[PDB]
């Protein structure tokens, strides 16, 4: 079962992602195949998959940027029927916006079936060009046809996953306590994490004893990532990953406040120094408290 989360959905035959054209929130905006850049935010190509209660392997798919939903036009089972962005809600009963998502016969990619029509999401002709039509099409669950197979590249972590990555880290103090604030988090490439840091004004901030010292830099970075998230995305039901940590050095006589993010494989944390933009596997401190 596909987990609740944010996905970049990539065709299995050609390197085209499921893209809501121009990120537009208009009803009837085409969903199309489009090329992508790895290790970036692909602004029109992120999809929040929300499981429907008691309806096995079935989801709404909400574009993270537009807040509108993947919609099979009038629910038609006719092959070639347009797939578009359309207004909706996370737990809608409109079958046009409900999608059963299960592993394909290659066991890695998925097929995406409309719950009402029983047709599948199809990159028409396998066309690799930017703006290629995606449509609902006749098919089967087991066939090999790559036009209807899709890698769900997971871009978020659950809170349990984030906690797991922290608990793997060797620089955690014995007295550590962690405070979880949300449920599901977009993990940022470092290029983006750094951009938010730059755009916050923190690179220009001077360290000043107590009035703007390490704890202020760290809390300000976290607030800047929270503001970026709300100002950047129209969908709801997720947060952006940026932690704050307090830590103590090995001698026990100095403490520090700093940020952390997650590795690209989502398995480990990496520390960020908000006073200079540096990423570190070892910041010189063991964390006694985190919130994220």
Ligand X SMILES: OC[C@H]1O[C@H](O[C@@H]2[C@@H](O)[C@@H](O)O[C@H](CO)[C@@H]2O)[C@H](O)[C@@H](O)[C@H]1O
Ligand Y SMILES: C[C@@H]1O[C@@H](O[C@@H]2[C@@H](O[C@H]3O[C@H](CO)[C@H](O)[C@H](O)[C@H]3O)[C@@H](O)[C@@H](CO)O[C@H]2O)[C@@H](O)[C@H](O)[C@@H]1O
Ligand Z SMILES: C[C@@H]1O[C@@H](O)[C@@H](O)[C@H](O)[C@@H]1O
Structure tokens at 52: 């429907």
Task: Identify the CA nearest to 49 among candidates 13, 102, 105, 12.
Answer: 102
Residues β-bridged to residue 102: 111
**Region 171-210 residues binding ligand X, contact defined as CB under 6 A:** none
How do 239-240 and 184-186 pair as beta strands? parallel
Contact with ligand Z (CB under 6 A): which of 92, 94, 190, 194?
A: 94
Cα angle: 283, vertex 289, 292; to 5 degrees: 90
Q: How many positions of this chain bind ligand X (CB under 6 A)?
A: 22
**Which range in 44-52, 107-115, 119-127, 200-208 contacts ligand X by CB under 6 A?**
119-127
Q: Residue 96 annotated as binding?
A: yes
Contact by Cβ (8 Å): 13, 106: no
> Could you say whether residue 44 binds ligand Y (CB under 6 A)?
yes
- Read off the DSSP letter of residue 14: S
User: Could you tell me the two tokens for 123?
Assistant: 């990159």
Q: Binding of a second copy at residue 209 (CB under 8 A)?
A: yes
CB of 239 to Ca ion, least distance (A): 4
Contacted by 87, from Cl ion, ligand X, ligand Z, none: CB < 5 to 8 Å by type:
ligand X
H-run or E-run covering 228: helix 214-232
Site for Cl ion in 137-176 (CB under 5 A): 143-145
Distances (CA, A) of 12 to 78, 83, 195, 253, 291: 23, 18, 31, 54, 38
Other beta carbons within 10 Å of 88: 20
Instruction: Give the footprint of ligand Z on this chain (CB under 6 A).
Output: 94, 145
Instruction: Give the footprint of ligand Y on this chain (CB under 6 A).
Output: 19, 21-23, 34-37, 40, 42-45, 130
Instruction: Give the footprint of ligand X on this chain (CB under 6 A).
Output: 27, 71, 73-74, 79, 86-88, 92, 94, 96, 122, 124-125, 137-140, 143, 145, 147-148
Instruction: Give the footprint of a second copy on this chain (CB under 8 A).
Output: 177, 179, 181-184, 205, 208-213, 215-216, 219-220, 222-223, 226-227, 229-230, 233, 235-240, 246, 257, 289, 291
């Amino acid at each position: 079962s596909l987990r609740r989360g944010i996905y970049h959905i990539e065709n299995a035959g050609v390197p085209s992602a499921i893209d809501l054209k121009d990120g537009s929130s208009s009803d009837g905006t085409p969903i199309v195949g489009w090329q992508f850049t790895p290790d970036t935010i692909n602004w029109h190509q992120l999809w929040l998959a929300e499981p429907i209660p008691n309806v096995a392997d079935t989801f709404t798919l909400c574009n993270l940027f537009s807040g509108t939903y993947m919609d099979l036009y009038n629910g038609s089972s006719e092959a070639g029927t347009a797939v578009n962005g359309w207004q909706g809600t996370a737990f809608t009963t409109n079958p046009h916006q409900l999608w059963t998502i299960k592993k394909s016969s290659d066991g890695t990619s998925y097929k995406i079936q409309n719950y009402g029509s029983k047709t599948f999401v199809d990159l028409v002709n396998g066309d690799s060009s930017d703006g290629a039509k995606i449509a609902g099409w006749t098919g089967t669950w087991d066939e090999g046809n790559p036009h209807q197979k899709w890698y769900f590249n997971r871009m978020s972590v659950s809170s349990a996953e984030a906690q797991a990555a922290i608990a793997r880290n060797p620089h955690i103090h014995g007295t550590y306590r962690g405070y979880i604030l949300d449920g599901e988090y977009l993990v940022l490439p470092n290029a983006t994490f750094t951009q938010i840091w730059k755009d916050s004004g923190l690179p220009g901030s001077k360290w000043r004893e107590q009035i703007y010292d390490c704890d202020d830099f760290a809390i300000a970075m976290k607030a800047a990532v929270g503001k970026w998230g709300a100002d950047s995305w129209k969908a709801n039901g997720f947060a952006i990953f940026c932690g704050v940590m307090l830590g103590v050095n090995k001698a026990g006589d100095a403490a520090h406040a700093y940020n952390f993010t997650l590795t690209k494989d989502h398995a480990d944390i990496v520390f960020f120094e908000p006073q200079n933009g540096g990423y570190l596997n070892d910041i010189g401190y063991d964390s006694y408290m985190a919130f994220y």
